[PDB]
Design a binder for this molecule. Sequence first.
Ligand SMILES: *Cc1c(COP(=O)(O)O)cnc(C)c1O
Ligand SMILES: *Cc1c(COP(=O)(O)O)cnc(C)c1O
Ligand SMILES: NCC1(CC(=O)O)CCCCC1
Ligand SMILES: NCC1(CC(=O)O)CCCCC1
Ligand SMILES: [Mg+2]
Lengths: 358, 359
Amino acid sequence: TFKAKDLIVTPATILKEKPDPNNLVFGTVFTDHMLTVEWSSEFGWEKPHIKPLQNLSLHPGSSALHYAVELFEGLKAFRGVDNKIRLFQPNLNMDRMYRSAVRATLPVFDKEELLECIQQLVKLDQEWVPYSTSASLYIRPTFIGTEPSLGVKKPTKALLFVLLSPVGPYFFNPVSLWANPKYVRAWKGGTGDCKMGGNYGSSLFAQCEAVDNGCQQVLWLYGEDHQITEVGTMNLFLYWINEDGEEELATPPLDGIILPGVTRRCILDLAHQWGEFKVSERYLTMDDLTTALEGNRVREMFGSGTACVVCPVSDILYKGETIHIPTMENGPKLASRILSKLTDIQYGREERDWTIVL
Amino acid sequence: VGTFKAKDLIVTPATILKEKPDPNLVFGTVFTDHMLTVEWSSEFGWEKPHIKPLQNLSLHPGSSALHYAVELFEGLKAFRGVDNKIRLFQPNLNMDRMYRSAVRATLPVFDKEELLECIQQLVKLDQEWVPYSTSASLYIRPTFIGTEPSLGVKKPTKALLFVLLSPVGPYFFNPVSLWANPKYVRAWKGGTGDCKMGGNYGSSLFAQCEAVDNGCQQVLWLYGEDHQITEVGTMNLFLYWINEDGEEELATPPLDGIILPGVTRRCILDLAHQWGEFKVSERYLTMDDLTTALEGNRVREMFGSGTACVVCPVSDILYKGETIHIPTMENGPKLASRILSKLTDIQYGREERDWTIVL
Ligand SMILES: *Cc1c(COP(=O)(O)O)cnc(C)c1O
Ligand SMILES: *Cc1c(COP(=O)(O)O)cnc(C)c1O
Ligand SMILES: NCC1(CC(=O)O)CCCCC1
Ligand SMILES: NCC1(CC(=O)O)CCCCC1
Ligand SMILES: [Mg+2]
């Protein structure tokens, strides 16, 4: 494994102008520096670099281009209202990226060395961490196989790098979802519980089909009973009165077709902590939903993820009809409370072991 | 909404040419002198195609092919006939599959004829690499990748199409042993298993490793509660046997969405249908159908088909801690061998047929 202590820094000689915080398109503007660490089965890991944001030089046969031997992560840096820059649950991302690496047969690395390197990269480009309480700096760790051979096997050459991109919003701005059981995002025995590239390229066709049909995201359905799994590539939360008549906040269980979002776990933690309603990790089907709506039992439906934190849902185009979800006419009370809590913690307006300082 | 044209090819010869390897090669290990590349932007469409010296790709770190596997590929070969004339085999099908793939990936469409000609031109240039052997060929790897310099999961506004050339011999007869663990699923109804998109492959290296660890060379992909057998590693699966009706039969899974329509598969089905010596059935095959058959002496052969092996005999399957031997080798294998001879006779010009295009 590589070590932060060996970092080699090559500052850009011409720094870019920081963008306008009020209107940023997600992941389109990049900072001045990036992190890069090369690996080869022959000599192991080389020393990590922090150099000007540049194009990668890859052999046209790199397995990442042919067999999707790749995985990524998503985490943010926030400038606290006390002007101190913080990271949110960073070690959980390191753990997920590590487990995905193993399932991808990519080379392992010392989680703490990566986190420290990332902190240094952020520290160097710190002025990119927006001066806004509604904006942040997206951190994108990426791991690709660069095996020059076309043979399908464990890579003997790989690259690990990190990009920094100042972001505002990913897309309250409620969204409509397009539900069509003809497409499946992930399946049992699959790799859907990992952030491996191969899980997203296969979804673009359905995404496109949603856009030209009036929606902004796909509602992923699975199985014979049409379980509702995720809002686009965000975890799904349903706030309602369940079949037993008790107020409840529900989300699909981690049975292998659901990605264990950090946001997801935090909302469950805050929900369990408030103890004001039942919190269940259970299955939810379209019929559980439509049945519930015609009984006026649904209050809010939203998605969770690092980019949005939470993103309310107001409609679902299903069997040829549009099903309205009373999310926005109900506040959304909980959606807001949640977003309010999480950001309060991210920007240090509240102390809690979920953030890391500079 | 357009295409690039072979008539616009800008050729740039390498000044320093590499020495060809020994025709007797590690699959996809050695590459030729030149490559083909074609840039695409949603703003101006397809650029003009180039044939330049092999070289790295200069990609933006945010390229969508590295983050969301916005990619797809193909695999075909050129053969030097026993008449020294170089031949391509069923190219038009590869172009059709790549096309259908691009669309399923939301990558930009192109004129299949133009691409094919552009490929003939690339090979034509590097024809001396086409092995002077009868058991070796040149692997043609067309590749289509998204170069969207943005982290947003969306239809790419930038793409890159290229083609690599790699002289090769074999992939690994030489029977293989299969690892059958139902905990790993290659494809699912509603997914992209029936296209050659990179996302279907990265996710299997773990199972492959688990395979070797257990003395096996490939993974037998199982699907559904009834453990249907779908593909042998990344090759289509054929089972020559006496079915439940006592009839001689050549069976192979149907294209119901989780099997990739291989060119070698197509051919083997056409040959089988043509000879009309036994029943040819595209149907569901399960481990239980296989076990029941084996413990009844009803199995003749099992083998995978693909461009790299053409045909690959299966002799064993590790299932539920038990090793199940397949008598494929103790039966010639007559069918497997017959197929190999036939396809090879045709590819190397020994047999004349429409399945090839000379250059
Ligand atoms: C990244 C991701 C999420 C959200 O996880 P967070 O760690 O909370 O960002 C949800 N679903 C999918 C499919 C994802 O890729
Ligand atoms: C490419 C491929 C095949 C074989 O197709 P051929 O065109 O015969 O080489 C079989 N199965 C999978 C999963 C493939 O990707
Ligand atoms: N829905 C978005 C992300 C997750 C998130 O932050 O919600 C995953 C795909 C790559 C961009 C990020
Ligand atoms: N089994 C192999 C291939 C197909 C083939 O030619 O059999 C697909 C994966 C990438 C290498 C080629
Ligand atoms: Mg250590």
